[PDB]
Amino acid sequence: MEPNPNRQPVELNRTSLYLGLLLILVLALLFSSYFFN
Amino acid sequence: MEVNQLGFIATALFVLVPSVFLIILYVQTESQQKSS
């Protein structure tokens, strides 16, 4: 029960998130149609 | 309109599952300052 050093935090900034979302919202918008057949 | 049945759970979950990830990772970071 001794702390492991390698505990670095995680990063995704106010913008990267906008892209991440623009990335999904899109494919989602694209494939939706084909996901309906 | 005769379409596939999983259209909703497919397309939908496709949006909300990865999206929720990014959402998490952001507010998890924007809360370093305890702000958010």
């Binding site: 106010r14 918008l29 | 309109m1």
Partner: peptide, 30 residues
């Protein structure tokens, strides 16, 4: 039904335009 799914995306996205332009992280000249 599925056409709302199309219109929901279409829309949720126009608003990802809102935030990413107006509540976007600003350019800091330092």
């Amino acid at each position: 039904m599925e056409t709302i799914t199309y219109v929901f995306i279409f829309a949720c996205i126009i608003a990802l335009f809102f935030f990413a332009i107006f509540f976007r992280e600003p350019p800091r000249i330092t």
